Amino acid sequence: QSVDQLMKARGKVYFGVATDQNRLTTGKNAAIIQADFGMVWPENSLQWDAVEPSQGNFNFAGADYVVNWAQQNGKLIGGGMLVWHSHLPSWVSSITDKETLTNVMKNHITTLMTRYKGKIRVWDVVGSAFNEDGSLRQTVFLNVIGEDYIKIAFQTARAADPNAKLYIADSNLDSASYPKTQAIVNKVKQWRAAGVPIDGIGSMTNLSAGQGAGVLQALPLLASAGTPEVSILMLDVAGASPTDYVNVVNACLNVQSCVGITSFGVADPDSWRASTTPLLFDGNFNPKPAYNAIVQDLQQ
Numbered sequence: 001q002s003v004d005q006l007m008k009a010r011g012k013v014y015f016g017v018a019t020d021q022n023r024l025t026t027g028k029n030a031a032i033i034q035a036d037f038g039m040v041w042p043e044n045s046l047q048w049d050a051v052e053p054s055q056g057n058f059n060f061a062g063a064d065y066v067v068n069w070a071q072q073n074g075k076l077i078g079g080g081m082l083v084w085h086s087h088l089p090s091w092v093s094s095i096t097d098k099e100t101l102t103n104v105m106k107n108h109i110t111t112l113m114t115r116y117k118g119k120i121r122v123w124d125v126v127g128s129a130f131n132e133d134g135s136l137r138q139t140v141f142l143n144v145i146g147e148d149y150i151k152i153a154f155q156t157a158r159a160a161d162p163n164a165k166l167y168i169a170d171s172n173l174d175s176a177s178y179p180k181t182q183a184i185v186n187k188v189k190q191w192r193a194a195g196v197p198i199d200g201i202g203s204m205t206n207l208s209a210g211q212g213a214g215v216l217q218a219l220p221l222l223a224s225a226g227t228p229e230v231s232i233l234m235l236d237v238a239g240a241s242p243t244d245y246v247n248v249v250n251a252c253l254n255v256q257s258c259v260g261i262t263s264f265g266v267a268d269p270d271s272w273r274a275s276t277t278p279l280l281f282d283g284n285f286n287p288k289p290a291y292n293a294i295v296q297d298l299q300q
């Protein structure tokens with residue numbers, strides 16, 4: 001059974017997964033994605049340090065591979081992260097001049113989005129803009145451009161490809177009690193009212209065991225920011241308890257604006273934290289209990 005087809009049967013858009021050439025050409029990743037997932041994301045090959053490792057010298061080979069694979073297999077595509085402090089090459093990090101960085105940032109966004117114009121359902125435009133306490137993270141972008149970097153990034157993105165849904169993404173939004181959760185809500189409300197085209201909030205959902213239950217209330221909170229969409233991104237759960245996974249799926253089912261869920265990867269060995277067995281397929285590419293439990297939940 002296909003979690004993507006069951007999500008669609010329940011009125012959602014997709015169940016997605018992150019991938020890259022190195023996965024698609026190995027194991028059972030491609031076969032599982034074909035059968036079970038309706039949306040793919042280049043895991044790493046659109047991140048700034050991969051795709052623009054020296055300024056204005058882009059390397060699209062890896063991203064092209066995923067985009068072409070997706071098209072050939074009838075999958076939706078997400079891309080990102082366009083602006084993300086933690087995946088920057090050093091040439092970006094060292095810039096101290098506002099106009100310089102603004103133009104670099106605009107060029108980076110426009111170049112990526114125009115290359116695939118019309119093909120991409122979602123771009124994750126800005127990631128990790130908030131500190132844990134809800135303040136804006138003092139990244140090179142905030143420090144050199146100011147808070148306007150958000151507006152500039154999103155307006156640039158909307159100009160580059162108005163067909164795409166534009167998302168802000170952040171982590172540790174998995175509890176309604178966390179200050180970061182409300183902070184992103186109220187800033188997104190403020191920004192959208194000021195004309196910033198933020199179509200979605202994507203919750204990068206990297207959970208420890210037992211944290212799924214929190215998402216049942218965090219996601220409705222996120223949805224209160226009034227974006228047209230919300231989503232679950234980069235989903236993984238240490239231990240991969242069915243209880244945690246079903247909770248995350250149910251949170252999305254319970255939120256009308258939640259269009260879908262993207263898993264961080266297919267099989268545990270390829271996780272960023274493989275030893276925590278946090279994904280839905282084991283290293284033999286067999287579905288784990290949590291995969292079966294999500295299927296069964298969506299069927300009922």
Ligand SMILES: O=[N+]([O-])c1ccc2nn[nH]c2c1
Nearest residue numbers: 018080081124233234262264
């Ligand atoms: O949801 N995802 O797994 C995922 C992976 C990489 C990305 N980069 N930008 N957005 C992403 C989403």
